[PDB]
Symmetry: D2
Subunit: 437 residues, 4 copies
């Protein structure tokens, strides 16, 4: 029990303020994903600072609503791919006037962070209440424009699933999920840049698991060749796969944002649209599932085949609901049984990223096996929102038990508990702070 | 109706404290890269609950600026180029003080010895944390024990040259409590001459507002510096030239507590028997020295102006010095506890909380918005609650801690508060209140 | 803050063990309602003792499935109405062989207590786990037979609402809800008994609010005249009203017991029936509601009129779900607005039993105004089960704040906080223990 | 892997403790309506967190059975008709003891004076609870102060007739720790004669198993009773006739702690100055009396057989008596703490938890399943942690409490546990462990 709940919350917040304190090289840029989770970690201790994190992200939102996956603080510190590689400032009609951003997106966890800010703000008085109210007044339209872009421009055919054009957009790129989609990307001659002819991809979780690095950059070249135009990307992109996990998060996020719109008297037509997308994508997720187990499947749009992999993404339906009782029960059995949380070799009953009995299991490599506390955080938060109060409590209790040595790595070896790596911000610290406070 | 839930639960409050620990940017003060002896000790106290290694790094950094004779100076300057005043140029310790450290810019005065308390919090937390962290705490003590002994030895030998068991201060700044009724009459006898012409403006503001003289008699404060410089900060010569020499009874009691604490550390970690004996000897010298000052009926302690040869009588929290270190006979301690808990201090009916006011609200010197002339400082309550616990006053300790946590639960993390309205009044460079809260909770 | 959470849990459990310690005269008999809540209060500290409380109740279950509202420990201590007045031993074909019981029922909170026992049992090992498993193996059939009796014999016309034949069956008799139904009960000459010609009703919450005591006993005489025969009661009873609160609890209880059957591999046909009743009664509750506010209405079956009263029973739909978003939002506004929890004169934001602005409001008289912590407990537990995690948390936080003086009365004056009375067992202690532990 | 969550959280555990407080019916023991002096004190300690009035009623009931000379007897019988043995018939105090209370059946021996500790827990909790409950606690003290003084005065005057500062026991039962190596050699010198023929079976079992002689030498135990009866329990005559007279150094230290605690209560509630002075005087008499027994190198305390005129040397937790009351010179206290924390006691590597074993596992007398010959009693750890806190040993106190709570978290609430396996071994009439847990948490 190396840290008590107060000591652990103190250590988590210290490891979110980032000052003084192997660790990773920290860059000044801002990540869509990290921003949402820092906001969730911040809301317990500072609503103002949580609001500033989202305000800063959202001021880099594209004019069509897309939130890009990175916002660069500059173009000289050698981050790759950087502003020079993406070139959205000159190429994309919708890149913002005064911000440098990438040209891909990231899962819509943002409405979850907004809900955390508003919930914590309501218990804190008048001044802080008005800070959260002011944020909502200033950013509701932008959150709506983000959800509307995903629904209209990444579900052009109203199938209720979000289409990804890069594994990087999933949040879960070093994963078995995409291996077969990526295997059909065959790159040509990459153009000549001023960067080296072999520049290392800076974020190591974004490196391809087999150094097939041209594949990843070739997708960028296809995006740039149509200037990131959402109307033209389906004609030229070599990677087009409907991500069923992203889709379920989107459904949850639409339901959360609708409930926010009703609690805070937002325009009724927006609430209706939000409710409608939430049910559209709930059905889209369910449409992918196995008839026996309920497991969700990603869909390779180009290959026209259900991708079949044994990762945590299978459990997408448990986040957003929609399964019939029998198949939801089936799927919970899978989640809690020996292929996942009940695998007898696991040190803790957190969710492994890939099933230890899968052929693709790699106990040390990112989402191919290792345990990520932020994944268990997300399930526990979604379970509580679905009414699975005691399932949510047991996950939270298990996440805290694992986190209480105060290591705060972002992923751990699923059998030995060894901490395996840290991200730019500590998603695990944010998960622990939300769990405790 | 039963009290409403505070803005912050204990885990939320501990998180907010850890987030703010090295400065409340959440009206905020101007932050400098320099390191303060007092702030460093309390940041180390706040850090030990959440990271022993980071706490150790804070004291390692301070102690590497120790003077060759053992004095820990009140500031270590990160640079002499950002305009903090008085800075390296005004102090000129690097050229004038033989004992100033070779590769470190510092001031030439000292600060209360709360460091042994910080070391005790580091070692106490480290013991519970597994052998790797236990090792970083033992490595620290092996490397810094000599240094902590030499600090205490300097205070006992050079600021109590006549073995009276009280620490002599050459400036109100050395007390940690400068803006206070305690020193007004001693300052009123400092009469500056023609101050030398420096390269700064002749009007140059003292950067730290808690250090500005309450009356703007700023020449007085800077004149004491010139006296120190005139004798090159030589401990043998300062008593001949300083216009300010007062025995600080609060500093003296903290020193007594510190020697006792360090001595217990020295035994638990097989430090040299001769150091421990010395430490225990000083702890008793200064305990009795504190008691020697006390009022015969209330037990209240008194500072002593060495030059005026006069017991200074003021009604500030410094009167309760004997409660920290012990030593009072039983009936005067009860008397003094009655004074502390009664209507002149914690039981004053206008106080929002029962934390200790820095000056008694019924005193003529009471100013409810000015630093130590009345306002409530959580770090003072923390210091009392920690000392009460070590004296075996378990319930008194518990109730101070409870009351400090009640007051901190709005998350304001100011260093001092209006004692009647609870309005937060100012922040220091590091948040001592955040450190107090982290220790109380962690 | 007169008691800390540990001190308050200790005091609550002391005031549930009943020994040593104005207060009420405690009788050796066992109440259906009190038994369920004592079990909920006991599960945190002793699963075994919780199981013994329900086992003891259920061994007095009638052969048709009805759980009676009282189980008498004897017929000599002068409780009235006692075994001699009810006479179910000689009259009712289904009264149990070796137990003395009343001839009326009580809301089905029992499945909620069973869920608390199983949840707490799972975290406590092997021996205690087997104790809860053994209970379920022994009592699942009986819980099914209780739910089946309510659905088949108190909803004979499959309207999805439970019919009551006595205000005493509602759990909420001293209430504005029934005043107009009771006003149409006109009694004849009551038969001669050996008891006095004026025996005080022992439980004071069961006394009629206007000493029209003959009305209450006359209903008993109608039940006895057809020997409590469920097939004949609708022909002879002068009080027949569909209780929409009881109905919503029943729906929640069916959903809870179905989820129990799935977690603990109970027979699948039972789970199907449970799910079916849960949705039948959810719809029945919704069918009563106001088109503007969503407020639920009780139905007087004989008068054929919707009873319109401004009590907490209006909020029945919030317990079991089923309203459309707009009307659920409307109804939450009513609950949280100035007619109820946000009435500015209330000392705490617990739910008043009747709206302070209603004409029927009586700030000192049982369910006509006063604040009952067990009512707020039930809403908060149902809210958490519906996913309203932060609404559940704020109610629980408010209930604890009110309870932390350690007074443990069952109801309080809604404006001054004055404790107004104690029941046989402390439902409030059970609520506090569940909230804390 | 990081430790798994215990069967009970602190609120659940506090609830379970309060539910069990007056007897673990959840293998359970046979419960009698009688009241035990020792159990009554600890039930009052367990009750104060949850009900001051109920705690006050528990001591009021005990104290109404006090003898006219101040002795609190170890049992108050609710009746003499349920067959508890030895009962009113065997003790015959109602006819033989001039000082036995008029309308209350009691035994004729005493028990350690832990009552002042219970009073301190009642008053401490009452102070925080509002004026109505503050009033019921002041009313109790007004009514029972004389009585508590007369109890302490009886112990100081009649069980330390020669002002040696140690309490003389006339039976192992009076120690609260009868089934223990501490008394084996003193018992081995009791040689019974023809025991008188009573109306019970000649074989009649001692009802309380912790009171049965370990060796079934039951004649010895009952023979001491006959000696007491032969002199009508007269304090002046018992030293002439008793075959068992040993100074109990643990009882003596608890008495010293008790006098100190009661004296602090007497000042805080304006009790008579002469009572407080007496209390402080006895507290120091018995502190020094305890220290007088101690080993010269370890500081371990020793019981003294008055008749054999011999220091009893046994390796039980009673050696640590000086840690409770203070008084040891600094270096022998460190020695004795090294013994307590080291491999013969808390640091024994085979122990499941670091609670204090009743007998050292390396002793030849160590029996791991037999009462005080080895097993772990949470109430002993509670008593040490409470005394450590009053001595200012804040961290040692905290770590005992933490360790006791760790061990109690399975909810077993036994009074003593196998020290190697943690297996619960037996319950008393009231759950002292439940009271310890409620105090630690409440």
């Amino acid at each position: 029990p190396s840290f008590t709940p107060t000591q652990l919350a103190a250590r988590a917040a210290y490891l979110l303020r980032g000052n003084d304190l192997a660790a990773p090289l920290l860059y000044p840029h801002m990540w869509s994903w990290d921003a949402a989770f820092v906001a969730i970690g911040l809301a317990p201790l500072s609503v103002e600072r949580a609001v500033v994190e989202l305000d800063t992200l959202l001021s880099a939102q594209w004019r069509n609503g897309m939130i890009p996956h990175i916002v660069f603080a500059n173009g000289v510190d050698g981050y790759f791919p950087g502003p020079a590689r993406w070139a959205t400032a000159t190429l994309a009609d919708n890149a913002p006037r005064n911000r440098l951003t990438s040209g891909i997106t990231q899962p819509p966890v943002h409405a979850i962070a907004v809900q955390r800010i508003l919930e914590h703000a309501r218990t804190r008085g008048r001044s802080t209440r008005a800070v959260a109210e002011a944020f909502l007044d200033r950013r509701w339209g932008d959150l709506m424009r983000w959800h509307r872009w995903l629904a209209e421009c990444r579900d052009r055919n109203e199938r209720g699933r979000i289409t990804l054009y890069h594994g990087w957009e999933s949040g879960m790129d070093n994963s078995p999920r995409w291996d077969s989609a990526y295997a059909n990307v065959v790159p040509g001659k990459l153009p000549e840049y001023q960067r080296a002819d072999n520049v290392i991809i800076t974020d190591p979780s974004q490196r391809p698991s087999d150094g097939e690095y041209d594949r990843y950059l070739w997708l960028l070249e296809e995006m740039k060749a149509v200037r990131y135009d959402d109307e033209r990307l389906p004609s030229v992109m070599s990677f087009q796969v409907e991500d069923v996990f992203f889709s379920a998060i989107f459904s949850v996020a639409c339901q959360v944002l609708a409930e926010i719109g009703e609690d805070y008297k937002r325009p009724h037509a927006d609430v209706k649209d939000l409710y409608l997308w939430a049910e559209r994508f709930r059905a889209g997720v369910v449409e992918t599932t196995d008839q026996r187990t309920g497991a969700a499947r990603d869909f390779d749009v180009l290959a026209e085949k259900w991708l079949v992999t044994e990762t945590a993404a299978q459990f997408a339906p448990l986040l957003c609901g929609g399964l019939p009782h029998d198949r939801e029960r089936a799927l919970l059995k899978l989640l809690e049984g020996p292929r996942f949380c009940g695998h007898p070799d696991l040190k803790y009953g957190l969710i492994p990223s890939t099933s230890p009995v899968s052929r693709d299991f790699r106990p040390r490599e990112y989402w191919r096996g290792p345990v990520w506390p932020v994944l268990t955080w997300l399930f526990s938060w979604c379970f509580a929102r679905r009414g699975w109060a005691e399932r949510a409590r047991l996950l939270r209790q298990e996440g805290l038990r694992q986190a209480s040595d105060g290591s705060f790595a972002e992923y751990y070896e699923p059998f030995t508990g060894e901490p395996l790596g840290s991200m730019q911000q500590s998603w695990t610290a944010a998960a622990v702070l939300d769990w405790l406070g």
